Each structure stands twice: as C-alpha cells, then as structure tokens.
Amino acid sequence: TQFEERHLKFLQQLGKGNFGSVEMCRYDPLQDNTGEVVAVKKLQHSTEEHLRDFEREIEILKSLQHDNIVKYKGVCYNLKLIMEYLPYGSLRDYLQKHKERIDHIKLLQYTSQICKGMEYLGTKRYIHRDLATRNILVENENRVKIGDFGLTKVLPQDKEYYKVKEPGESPIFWYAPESLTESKFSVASDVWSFGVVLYELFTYIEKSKSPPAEFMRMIGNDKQGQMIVFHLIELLKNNGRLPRPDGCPDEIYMIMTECWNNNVNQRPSFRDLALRVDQIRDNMAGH
Ligand SMILES: CCn1c(C(=O)N(C2CC2)C2CC2)cc2c3c(ncn3C)c(Nc3cc(C)n(C)n3)nc21
Numbered sequence: 001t002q003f004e005e006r007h008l009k010f011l012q013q014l015g016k017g018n019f020g021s022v023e024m025c026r027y028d029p030l031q032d033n034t035g036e037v038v039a040v041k042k043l044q045h046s047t048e049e050h051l052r053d054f055e056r057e058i059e060i061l062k063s064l065q066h067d068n069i070v071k072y073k074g075v076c077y078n079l080k081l082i083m084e085y086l087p088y089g090s091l092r093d094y095l096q097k098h099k100e101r102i103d104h105i106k107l108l109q110y111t112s113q114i115c116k117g118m119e120y121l122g123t124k125r126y127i128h129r130d131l132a133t134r135n136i137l138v139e140n141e142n143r144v145k146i147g148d149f150g151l152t153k154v155l156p157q158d159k160e161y162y163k164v165k166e167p168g169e170s171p172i173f174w175y176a177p178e179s180l181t182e183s184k185f186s187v188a189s190d191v192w193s194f195g196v197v198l199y200e201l202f203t204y205i206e207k208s209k210s211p212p213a214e215f216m217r218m219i220g221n222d223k224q225g226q227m228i229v230f231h232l233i234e235l236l237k238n239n240g241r242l243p244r245p246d247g248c249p250d251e252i253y254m255i256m257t258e259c260w261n262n263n264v265n266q267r268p269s270f271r272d273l274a275l276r277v278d279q280i281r282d283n284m285a286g287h
Contacts, residue, residue, distance in 0.1 A: 041081040068117030088138030096205040119270035131193040161186040173211040195259025202245040
C-alpha cells in the first residue's frame with residue numbers, strides 16, 4: 001500500500017491531462033527486474049491547491065472497487081498515485097488504431113461497461129465531470145475502465161448538483177448546457193457527456209468528426225475564444241446537436257439525442273442506458 005520512490009523505475013511518459021501526468025514504471029523493490037509494471041500519476045506542477053485536490057482524487061479512487069474502474073494500488077510519498085497498468089492505453093487511441101476490427105456490437109460492449117462504471121459512481125454520489133474517450137482505458141479487447149478521476153466531485157449531502165468553475169481549459173464540447181451557463185455538475189450532466197462519448201465511439205475518432213471540430217463548424221471557425229462558449233450555449237439552446245455519425249443505426253443515435261436533452265430532469269438514468277444498450281446488443285447478437 002506504501003510504495004518507495006527508490007524502487008519506482010521510470011519506463012515511459014503515458015500522458016498529460018488537467019494538471020496531472022501519468023508514467024509507466026516498474027516497481028522493482030528486489031532490484032532483480034521481477035517487479036510489476038504500474039501506472040504512476042503525479043502533478044505536472046505542485047501547488048497547495050493542486051495538492052489538496054489530488055489528495056481528494058486519491059481518496060475518491062481508493063473508495064472505488066469495480067471491474068470497469070481503474071484499480072488503485074497505493075501512494076508514493078512529491079505525492080504520487082500508483083494504479084494498475086492497462087496495456088492497451090486510452091480507448092480514444094485504441095479505437096482509432098483498430099477501427100477495421102471493432103464492429104458495432106463491440107462498441108456497445110464498451111458502452112455497456114462505461115454505463116455500469118458510471119452507475120457505480122452514482123451510488124457513491126460522485127460526479128465524474130470529464131467523461132470522454134481519452135479518459136477511458138482498455139484492459140483487453142473485451143474490457144474498458146474509467147481511467148482517471150482528476151475532476152471528480154462528491155455531491156453535497158442535501159443537493160443533486162455541485163457548482164464549480166475551475167481555472168484552466170474546460171472540455172466545453174462535452175459539457176451539458178447547465179454546466180456551461182451555471183457551472184452546475186450532476187449525474188444528469190455526466191449522462192449528457194456520456195452521450196458525447198457514445199457519439200465519439202460511433203465516429204471511430206475520425207479527426208474531422210470530433211465534437212470540437214463539429215461544434216466549431218456549426219458555430220463558425222472565425223469565432224474568437226471567450227465568444228466560442230457564448231455561441232455554443234446559443235447553439236445548444238436552439239437544439240443544435242452533433243450529427244448522426246456515419247453508419248450509426250437510428251436506435252443508437254436516439255440514445256445520444258435523449259442524453260442531450262436541454263431539460264436536465266428528462267435525461268435517462270445510467271441504469272436505463274445500460275438496459276437499453278444491452279437490449280440492442282442482444283438484438284444484434286440474436287440471443
Ligand atoms: C492514455 C495515457 N494514460 C493515462 C493518461 O494520460 N491519463 C491522463 C490524466 C493524464 C488518464 C487516462 C485519462 C493514464 C493511463 C494509464 C495506463 N494504464 C494505466 N493507467 C492509469 C495507460 N496505458 C498505456 C499503455 C500504453 C502502451 N499506452 C500508450 N498507454 N495509459 C494511460
């Protein structure tokens with residue numbers, strides 16, 4: 001549960017995301033090259049505010065035990081979070097690399113797993129706030145896991161939403177309209193973002209088809225910066241939405257459009273999304 005820095009052998013930089021950085025290391029206390037490979041998360045720049053947020057993130061991950069949630073292994077005290085290493089990396093990269101071999105029934109198997117991991121977060125009153133394929137990891141060809149909790153918040157005991165406005169770049173093209181306008185995050189805004197994840201999956205991460213590329217096309221690429229959010233809010237209010245991805249069945253696009261309801265209370269639950277996705281999977285498989 002306690003890892004010693006001296007036995008953490010650097011192997012490679014895996015990625016960066018919102019003030020965090022993840023590396024692949026071998027934890028080799030015997031110094032005989034038999035230790036397991038682990039993923040290590042650290043702050044790119046240490047500040048008291050980022051350290052307090054990182055400590056809360058660690059406590060959140062340690063509290064989660066689910067097949068579709070990356071496993072917490074421990075800490076290294078320059079605080080570092082030690083997690084299991086997942087050999088296939090992000091679902092965003094994996095899908096882009098294997099698009100010719102991943103069919104719709106496989107995309108739905110991954111979709112169902114993301115729904116189950118999200119419903120489990122919901123039982124703990126945790127709001128992920130950053131659902132996107134870049135934040136989902138691939139354990140093997142048959143299993144994905146929610147792979148980062150850097151923006152995850154715990155709902156207050158007496159409210160169904162949490163208001164936050166973080167400095168830094170926010171993933172506005174995955175945000176629910178009430179998150180853009182009122183900085184309100186909830187299980188319902190995670191469902192909106194889940195709809196964007198489902199869109200990402202069915203586009204197979206085709207560059208010109210990404211949510212930022214499609215929304216910027218609809219808003220106009222000429223739009224400033226501070227004005228992008230303003231125009232995005234107006235577009236969503238007017239029921240402007242990401243288009244049906246090429247080859248996506250109507251039934252699947254309908255799930256996305258239902259997640260993208262402006263009325264927060266009308267969005268489906270993660271339990272109903274899992275039922276719906278599993279029913280469609282069953283239909284496609286015949287059994
Ligand atoms: C996709 C890179 N990455 C990340 C990562 O940057 N972030 C953001 C926060 C900085 C989280 C995923 C949002 C984490 C992990 C990770 C991995 N295994 C466990 N964890 C925990 C992994 N494996 C792999 C294997 C290989 C070969 N690659 C390329 N990546 N890549 C990761």
